[PDB]
Design a protein around this nucleic acid. Structure first.
Length: 462
RNA sequence: GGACCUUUAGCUCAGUUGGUUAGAGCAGACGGCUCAUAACCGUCCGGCCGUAGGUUCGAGUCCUACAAGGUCCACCA
C-alpha cells in the first residue's frame, strides 16, 4: 500500500512512466480508494490524473449516490472528473449479448474514447488480488484455461498505450483497511446481496472456504498468475515463429503444411492453431478449443487424406494429402467440362494447362513420356473429345497391365481431389478413352506401323 | 490385370457374438455464464446405414457385384 503497490508499479514497470492517465471507477469503497492512491503517487511520479466513472443500468440509489459522490471528490481534489452513463444495457443486449459482457465492452468502449480523445497513455482500473483469485477459479471451471487461463493481466496493450491494474498486488482486505484508515463513508458493501452472478457466488461462499484454508491466498494466486504469465508469453513467441515456418504463405486464405507442422511439439501445434484461427477473425464464442483444436489435430494424424471439418461461422477445414486448407469460404463451386478436339488447334483448359494438336508427315521422335500422345487418323473414329472424369470410366494400358478404372489411377498417383475433377481425359468419337494427360496412356497410341499421316497431342502449361 | 482395406446423418467416429432400440461429437437453429479480450454449460433440428442382388425366421452386422475413397503391386519407367 502506497509502496507495496508502488513496488508493484515498479516491479511490472511501464506503469509509472510518462504523464497521462484515465483511472476508472465504479461501485464505492474500492473505486474511490484507487483514485486516492493514484493522486498521491502521481504527484510523486510526474503525472496528470483523470477520474472516469460510467453508470450502467440497474440504477436506484446506486446510480446516483455512486455517481455524485465521485463528482464531489473530483472537485475535492481538483481533478477532471470525466463522467458518463449508459442504460442501454437493455438495448445493448437487444443488439446481441448477455449482461456482464455489455459491462466491460461498453465500459471499455468509453475508456477508449477518453484515452484517444484525451491523449492519455495509460488507463488504470483497480482489480484486487481477490478479483484475481475469483477470475482464476471462475475461469478454471469454465474451461478457458490455455494461455487465457492466465488471470487478470497486470498491464496490457490498450488501444494506444496500455491498461494497468496495480491493485492486483493487494487484498480487498487491505483495500478496506486503506479506505477507512484514510477516510471514506461505510467501508465495504452491506448490499452485496446479489448471488445473481456466478462471479459472486465464488466470492460469497467459495473464496472464503479457501480464504480459511490459507490466509495468504490472494498471494499464492498472484505468484501463480505471474508464473503462467511469463511461461505463457514465452511459448507465444515460439508459437508465432512456428506459425510462419509452417504457413504456405500469401493466398486469399491460408494453407498449412501438415508435415513440418506435425514435426513440431504439441504445445506449439496447439498454439499456432489457436493463433491461426484468431488471425482468421478473433476468438469467437462457440469455439470450444478442446473440441476444435483437437479435431484439427486429429484431422492431420489421420490415415485418410481426404478430410472435411465444419467450424464456427461456417469456417471450413480441409486436408489434401499434405496440405491443410483453411477457407471459411466454400469450395463448391461446381465443375466439369466437355470439348471436341479440333486439329490442329490450341485448346486451353480450366486448369491452367492446355492441349496442342498437330499433323505430322513423319513419326514423332521425342523422348518416351506422358505429356504427349500419338494417334492414327485411320485406326480410330474422330473427332476427338477431351472431357472430365465420369462415374465408371476405364481404359487399357500401353503394354500389359490390362484394363483399369480411372478412379483407381488418380488415387494411386495421389492427386488432389479438386484436381481429379478438373483433370482432362481424352476419348475418341466412340467414347473410348485414349490418353490421360501426364498420367497414363491407353494401348491405342498409334505405333509406328507406317509413315502414313499422324496426329500429335502435347499437354502443357500456361 | 494382381493384393489388402474403408464406407453409419452436411462433416468427423461407436455400433456388443447376426435381432433392431443405431449411439456420440462438429457444424446449423435455439437458451444461458464472461465485472476477463477472447476458446464454457444445457436444448433442439438432422439415420435411405454408398447403390442394387442375394444367404437367413431375422440383417447396419455375412456373401456378390458395381461405385467412390485408400495403401501396395503391375503397366507405364
Amino acid at each position: 500500500m502506497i509502496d507495496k503497490v508502488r513496488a508493484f508499479i515498479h516491479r511490472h514497470q511501464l506503469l509509472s512512466e510518462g504523464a497521462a492517465v484515465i483511472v476508472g471507477v465504479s461501485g464505492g469503497p474500492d473505486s474511490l480508494a484507487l483514485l486516492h492512491v493514484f493522486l498521491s503517487l502521481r504527484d510523486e511520479w510526474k503525472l496528470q490524473v483523470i477520474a472516469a466513472h460510467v453508470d450502467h443500468m440497474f440504477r436506484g440509489r446506486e446510480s446516483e449516490e455512486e455517481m455524485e459522490f465521485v463528482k464531489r471528490f473530483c472537485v475535492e481534489r481538483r481533478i477532471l472528473c470525466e463522467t458518463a452513463q449508459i442504460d442501454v444495457p437493455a438495448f445493448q443486449r437487444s443488439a446481441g449479448l448477455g449482461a456482464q459482457e455489455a459491462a466491460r465492452i461498453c465500459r471499455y468502449r468509453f475508456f477508449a474514447e477518453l484515452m484517444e480523445k484525451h491523449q492519455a497513455g495509460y488507463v488504470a482500473v483497480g482489480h484486487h488480488g481477490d478479483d484475481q483469485v475469483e477470475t482464476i477459479l471462475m475461469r478454471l471451471v469454465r474451461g478457458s484455461t490455455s494461455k487465457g487461463y492466465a488471470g487478470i493481466p497486470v498491464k496490457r496493450p490498450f488501444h494506444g498505450g496500455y491498461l494497468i491494474r496495480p491493485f492486483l498486488a493487494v487484498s480487498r482486505a487491505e483495500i478496506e483497511a486503506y479506505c477507512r484508515q484514510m477516510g471514506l463513508s461505510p467501508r465495504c458493501d452491506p448490499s452485496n446481496e446479489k448471488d445473481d452472478y456466478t462471479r459472486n457466488r465464488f466470492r460469497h461462499h467459495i473464496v472464503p472456504l479457501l480464504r480459511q484454508e490459507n490466509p495468504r491466498l490472494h498471494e499464492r494466486f498472484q505468484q501463480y498468475s505471474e508464473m503462467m504469465a511469463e511461461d505463457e508469453q514465452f511459448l507465444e513467441e515460439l508459437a508465432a515463429d512456428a506459425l510462419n515456418k509452417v504457413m504456405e504463405k500469401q493466398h486469399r486464405d491460408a494453407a498449412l503444411s501438415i508435415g513440418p507442422f506435425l514435426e513440431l511439439p504439441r504445445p506449439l501445434q496447439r498454439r499456432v492453431l489457436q493463433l491461426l484461427l484468431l488471425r482468421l477473425y478473433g476468438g469467437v464464442p462457440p469455439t470450444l478449443t478442446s473440441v476444435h483444436i483437437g479435431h484439427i489435430l486429429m484431422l492431420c494424424e489421420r490415415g485418410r487424406p481426404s478430410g472435411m471439418i465444419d467450424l464456427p461461422k461456417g469456417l471450413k477445414v480441409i486436408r489434401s494429402y499434405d496440405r491443410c486448407l483453411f477457407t471459411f469460404d466454400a469450395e463448391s463451386g461446381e465443375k466439369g467440362y466437355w470439348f471436341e478436339l479440333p486439329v490442329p488447334a490450341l485448346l486451353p483448359l480450366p486448369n491452367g494447362y492446355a492441349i496442342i494438336s498437330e499433323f505430322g508427315e513423319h513419326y514423332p521422335r521425342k523422348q518416351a513420356g506422358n505429356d504427349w500422345f500419338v494417334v492414327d487418323p485411320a485406326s480410330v473414329s474422330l473427332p476427338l473429345r477431351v472431357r472430365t472424369r465420369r462415374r465408371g470410366d476405364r481404359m487399357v494400358l500401353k503394354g500389359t497391365g490390362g484394363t483399369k478404372k480411372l478412379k483407381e489411377i488418380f488415387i494411386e498417383a495421389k492427386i488432389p481431389r479438386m484436381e481429379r475433377d478438373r483433370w482432362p481425359i481424352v476419348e475418341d468419337a466412340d467414347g473410348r478413352i485414349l490418353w490421360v494427360p501426364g498420367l497414363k496412356k491407353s494401348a491405342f497410341e498409334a505405333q509406328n506401323r507406317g509413315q502414313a499421316r499422324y496426329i500429335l497431342l502435347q499437354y502443357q502449361a500456361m
